Design a binder for this molecule. Structure first.
Ligand SMILES: Cc1cc2nc3c(=O)[nH]c(=O)nc-3n(C[C@H](O)[C@H](O)[C@H](O)COP(=O)(O)O)c2cc1C
Ligand SMILES: Cc1cc2nc3c(=O)[nH]c(=O)nc-3n(C[C@H](O)[C@H](O)[C@H](O)COP(=O)(O)O)c2cc1C
Lengths: 105, 105
């Protein structure tokens, strides 16, 4: 599965890490992912109601679990079984979010 | 795959998060994982040289990728394809580690 960790302090929530699984899934190299928001995987047939629900959860700092349509680098679509979860530190401060993508096409 | 996030500030490196995939893999519920170190998955046939190499990387704050034998709750063994990676914050401070377990038995 793809595993990404976005910095939840800077605005826009950039990716600061992606495993090899996420590079095989989407087809993007680690150098074209780091620093960008994971919304680049969306496209013309991505359901906006699923995305809106996902952006509310991220903005409220709560976990999420959705099924939205994404698009590899080659432009081929795939069902993405995304699962978001908020990470906090020792003194109770949101620092990161962990995402877990799984292809269920 | 199993995904865990250990707090890298407190000593011992406790688990502060584990996805459902990690609960299906190991067979331990989320309530018996949180607060413990992921070394509870080791057993009598776990190669100590692989574990020592893993503890050096964690202590040096560097990524790792090993293949050690673990044990589910039921006592059944499995090849664990572990992949460790260090997480840092905005002002360059190690806060967490992300682990990715995959069964390759
Ligand atoms: C950690 C994390 C991982 C995300 N992964 C994905 C993803 O894999 N695919 C996707 O379409 N959106 C993903 N998102 C959603 C976007 O980051 C963004 O929050 C969403 O598109 C809504 O924001 P917007 O309405 O401003 O575009 C992820 C968000 C976070 C915080
Ligand atoms: C984030 C993270 C995840 C880990 N996951 C596992 C695991 O799934 N299985 C395992 O046998 N050891 C795992 N370890 C290794 C132990 O946490 C520990 O570092 C290792 O057993 C060496 O420490 P020790 O020699 O003091 O026991 C993980 C370590 C970290 C930091």
């Amino acid at each position: 599965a793809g595993v990404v960790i976005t910095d939840a302090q800077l605005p826009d929530y950039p990716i600061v890490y992606c495993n090899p699984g996420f590079v095989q899934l989407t087809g993007y190299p680690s150098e074209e992912v780091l620093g960008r928001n994971c919304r680049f995987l969306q496209g013309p047939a991505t359901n906006p109601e699923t995305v809106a629900r996902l952006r509310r959860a991220i903005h409220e700092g709560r976990p999420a679990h959705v099924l939205l349509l994404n698009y590899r680098k080659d432009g081929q679509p795939f069902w993405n079984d995304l699962r978001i979860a908020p990470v906090r530190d020792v003194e109770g401060r949101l620092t990161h979010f962990v995402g877990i993508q799984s292809d269920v096409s």
